Symmetry: D2
Subunit: 287 residues, 4 copies
Amino acid sequence: PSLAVADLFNVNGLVAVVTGGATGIGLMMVRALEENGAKVYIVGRRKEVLEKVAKNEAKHGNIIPLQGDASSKDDLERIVAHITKETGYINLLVANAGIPGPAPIKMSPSSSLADIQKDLWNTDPAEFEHIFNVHVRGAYFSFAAFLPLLSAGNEKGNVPQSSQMIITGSIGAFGRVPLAHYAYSASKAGVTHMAKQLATAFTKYGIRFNVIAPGLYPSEMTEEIVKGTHQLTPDEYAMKVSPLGRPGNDEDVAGCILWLASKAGAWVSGNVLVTDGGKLGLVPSSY
Amino acid sequence: PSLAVADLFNVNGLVAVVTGGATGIGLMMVRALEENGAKVYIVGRRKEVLEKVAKNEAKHGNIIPLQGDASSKDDLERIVAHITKETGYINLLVANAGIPGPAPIKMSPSSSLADIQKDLWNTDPAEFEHIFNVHVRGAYFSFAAFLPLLSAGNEKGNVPQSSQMIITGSIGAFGRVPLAHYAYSASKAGVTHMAKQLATAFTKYGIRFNVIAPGLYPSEMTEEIVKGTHQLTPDEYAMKVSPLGRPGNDEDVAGCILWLASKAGAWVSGNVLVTDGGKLGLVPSSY
Amino acid sequence: APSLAVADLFNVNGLVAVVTGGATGIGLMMVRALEENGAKVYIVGRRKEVLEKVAKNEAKHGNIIPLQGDASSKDDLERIVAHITKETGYINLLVANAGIPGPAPIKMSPSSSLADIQKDLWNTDPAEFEHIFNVHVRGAYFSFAAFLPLLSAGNEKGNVPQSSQMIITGSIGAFGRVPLAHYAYSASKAGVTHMAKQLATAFTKYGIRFNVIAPGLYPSEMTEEIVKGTHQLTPDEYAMKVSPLGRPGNDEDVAGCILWLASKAGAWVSGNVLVTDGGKLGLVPSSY
Amino acid sequence: APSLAVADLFNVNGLVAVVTGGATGIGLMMVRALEENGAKVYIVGRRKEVLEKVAKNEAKHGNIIPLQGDASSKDDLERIVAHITKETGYINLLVANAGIPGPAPIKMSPSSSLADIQKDLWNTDPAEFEHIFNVHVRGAYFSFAAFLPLLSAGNEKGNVPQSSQMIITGSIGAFGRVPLAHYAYSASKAGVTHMAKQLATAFTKYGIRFNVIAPGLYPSEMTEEIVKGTHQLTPDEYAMKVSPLGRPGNDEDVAGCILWLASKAGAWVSGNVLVTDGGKLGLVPSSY
Ligand SMILES: NC(=O)c1ccc[n+]([C@@H]2O[C@H](COP(=O)([O-])OP(=O)(O)OC[C@H]3O[C@@H](n4cnc5c(N)ncnc54)[C@H](OP(=O)(O)O)[C@@H]3O)[C@@H](O)[C@H]2O)c1
Ligand SMILES: NC(=O)c1ccc[n+]([C@@H]2O[C@H](COP(=O)([O-])OP(=O)(O)OC[C@H]3O[C@@H](n4cnc5c(N)ncnc54)[C@H](OP(=O)(O)O)[C@@H]3O)[C@@H](O)[C@H]2O)c1
Ligand SMILES: NC(=O)c1ccc[n+]([C@@H]2O[C@H](COP(=O)([O-])OP(=O)(O)OC[C@H]3O[C@@H](n4cnc5c(N)ncnc54)[C@H](OP(=O)(O)O)[C@@H]3O)[C@@H](O)[C@H]2O)c1
Ligand SMILES: NC(=O)c1ccc[n+]([C@@H]2O[C@H](COP(=O)([O-])OP(=O)(O)OC[C@H]3O[C@@H](n4cnc5c(N)ncnc54)[C@H](OP(=O)(O)O)[C@@H]3O)[C@@H](O)[C@H]2O)c1
């Protein structure tokens, strides 16, 4: 019953997998996990980027890059086989990979309703379709693929906490003001619900499910939005970014992932972690 | 300020469109709407069924059958053009079309976890992908297609209530026990959220959005589940069907659609109508 | 019979109903629609002279029976139930609509320092607080506890095909995260809304359905002033403080809700939160 | 500095905290982790002798300062704030953890008639009701109103990089729709949970973040009996009344939550409901 931070929150010997682990939020996660004792497979579509981050960003050489398309049912099969070969188990799957939606439907006070349909109808049917394959379908099959590996990590018992899958949702799953496209938000709402359904099914089998629901974070997606923020009256930053007056950072993400992956988070299943800076309390939502 | 039921709840002169209007729930809607004064275009993929129901089921000959694929962006364009030709406006779009998901992942107490992945991984990637095109993408483009027609119904002013789009969700959007496949539920959660986002955007433009969230109803999907119910201890019917001891019926659906489409419902936007017989209160949910 | 006709579906002929706060504001619009469309409606208030006017003047068939009582007082409920258990023997529908406004709201004007806003916060009286909760939550609980035999009897007399039912007037303040009243009002409505979902979970299996009506802005005795104030609002503020449809609610809106849920149309509804808000909730920070 | 190291991220060195109910059960596990990891922790209870034991015996650095008071009493709060305003001058973290169990729960056994279940329902005492709401909701409000200067001061002293913060111990009973306690307990927790979201909406812009910890089953003074009872449960009932992970919570679980939200790790969290339930909520009817 040692309550020291270094004992509670370390992830020594934890074997983790992070899709989208080489940029933005996913990167801040693997940097937190590896610096504090873990072996973190990062899975991306760009073999570079995965490489550059495996070297350079590791502090102990425990970022193992592993190229794959987390939405492709067959790339998952080859990625699982490899990790079954090289390691035999994992303890933590983090479904963080994500795309931005179709272009947002712009509604400027000087847009007629006739113009806003022009926008609405232009949206391409194959995009708004794909965001759903990455965010929802892709999460489902990621779980289906690693479930033996996750079941094995419970048997090896290298960590006292249960095997666990974390899913990067969005506060867009609750924010009712379409700041992106209705498809990003709708897919995040869909994956957030599926996550609660999986915790309902599979916690009894010893695989806990949790959702991290981020506000505004500097990633490759938000690169431009973050640049734009520098041009906002305080009262706007406070409503579009955070009333605490900043977007999130490495340490914020480090706290979340380290809390839920360690023994501290060993009894958490079905939690939606809202790390938003307080933004959700300021926009119309359903949280 | 006449408060008589016949004055409040009539839909005389209302021009409505109901996808999936020729079977199950959608049928009970168009029968309620047409019997009480409306012109109801029913849109389906089977030209028959739409026909059989246009004759036979109408009581005033105001069911106009109109074949189309409500998910196909191009069939919507031809359906809109036709209704713009023949009528010029609509007052009410009802996105009721729906498919059942992939086969549910069965979890029988005598299934090992090794077996339940076998199930989970078998799910086809093109199905769990399509339910999302019908339920979410298909709803979006249905709104995008009829938005001029809905904007016109506000101008013709044949009814005092605003133009309105209703979307048939599901209590599966909140039920956390996967009674179907995680994709049905996840798509319904996604469309339910998009509906709240559209009410947030477009009520100010005079198009109200509402969701009907049905429990167990005798349709073509539930045909078998309803047969199976006859074999349940009361305490099971009460938890899998309704603690009131029956599934829903024509009059239940008639009440919902007639309430939200008439002047009675003229001030409702953003409501999720849960017509479930009380089931949701008995299963793990997030409502 | 499968009559999908408005006059057959939505009539409340022979329905015996009880409406607390039934003589002003929202509660009045409910009794006027229930009685006009065939019901016998007991209205329960404390101001007996207000009940008598409504019962004589607002009825169209003389079926508003005024009956003075304090719906929060456990002992007034006991005497009210008895009168009905004698004069009538059963009810089909209990409507817990009685409500008070909270303590004074905490003013947060852009030119208030945080030092000033505590001055406000701390001034709130502990009894106005502890009191809004007795009317809205405790008062609803005991109203249900008192009428439960009468509600169980209405299932036996079977004068209506729908189950016996209790409706509770909550608020969109149960989900709205910007307090337009005191944190006590909103917190009590959130509390009663949840208790209502818990009662539908318990008691639908025994044939008493529970539902919540969650109103936006409605002209009542509580909102009178706020409604007067609305007349000085840019369209854009009005669309956000009131409704993007450009009006507050009215008799017919309330008539639709209560007539839908009390009739055979609503006979299969239990655990629904009916949000009749004009779309406001979609515009303010909420948790709906 | 961007030290992504557990000892740098999650330490609470120099944090000045206040924990109501900090001498038993959950509140104790919080102070033991805050103090062991570097904080000065005022514990506020009514039983002064229980505060003194914990402060002498459970500290590892002698930084548990016992301080008797009634967290629901508006006037005891006034005297507590003053002591701290003199002895210390600021706080960084207020934890409203004090709580009571409700009235006796309404027993609904399969062999209870509905006539019997009203007997139960109506027996509930109007004061036990009106009282659970004063501790859980009213008591939380005035605790915030009292410490708001002290919380505003901790932002100025800047002994920690994170904002001043108030945490509120809610319950998964705020979402669980099957009442395992009285409808009053659940309804008060739902009410305080909502007020907490409303306060984060108001006061994060002024630099006081609000968050809710929502516990499942934890061994405290309130749950002692229930925990004893669990030892006679088929695995399947235990998985549903307790947790599908097969245990109730413990010191380390609570330590993780409070240390995550009070440290620099949690410095950007406002409006989060932390559900630490072992997965129970996913198994019972809920509204989360
Ligand atoms: N940043 C924010 O403010 C914010 C807010 C709310 C939610 N989120 C969520 O945070 C998550 C992370 O995105 P981010 O913000 O960190 O943006 P980012 O910097 O663009 O990271 C996205 C990552 O996803 C990977 N990825 C995308 N599709 C993939 C696939 N099919 N297979 C494997 N990897 C794939 C990309 O790697 P490749 O391109 O090499 O494949 C990329 O590294 C997303 O789910 C996003 O929705 C972010
Ligand atoms: N019944 C229940 O218990 C229940 C419960 C929860 C939710 N729901 C929802 O209720 C809605 C109605 O389904 P139902 O229960 O009435 O089942 P149903 O009897 O099978 O009705 C479904 C209808 O959808 C139509 N449809 C499907 N895809 C379409 C498309 N792309 N374009 C046009 N029409 C299309 C079908 O017509 P065609 O086959 O001719 O195209 C069919 O008439 C669905 O959204 C379902 O998810 C039902
Ligand atoms: N008006 C709105 O816009 C609005 C919006 C959201 C929610 N609501 C809710 O609607 C309800 C009130 O409706 P309203 O706005 O129409 O209020 P109102 O015009 O002020 O009338 C409320 C009625 O409650 C009665 N009442 C109060 N306490 C009572 C008690 N202990 N026993 C018996 N009767 C009692 C009052 O009659 P006596 O004083 O004579 O007893 C009064 O007639 C409350 O639940 C309120 O929160 C209203
Ligand atoms: N234990 C669980 O499993 C669980 C689950 C969900 C929620 N909770 C919540 O956790 C909180 C209680 O934690 P617990 O379960 O550990 O309870 P506990 O063991 O009974 O201790 C609660 C503490 O509250 C203090 N307290 C009560 N009223 C007070 C007041 N007016 N002023 C000051 N102190 C007061 C008591 O100290 P004195 O009596 O000496 O003042 C006591 O030490 C409540 O909010 C409860 O609803 C607990």
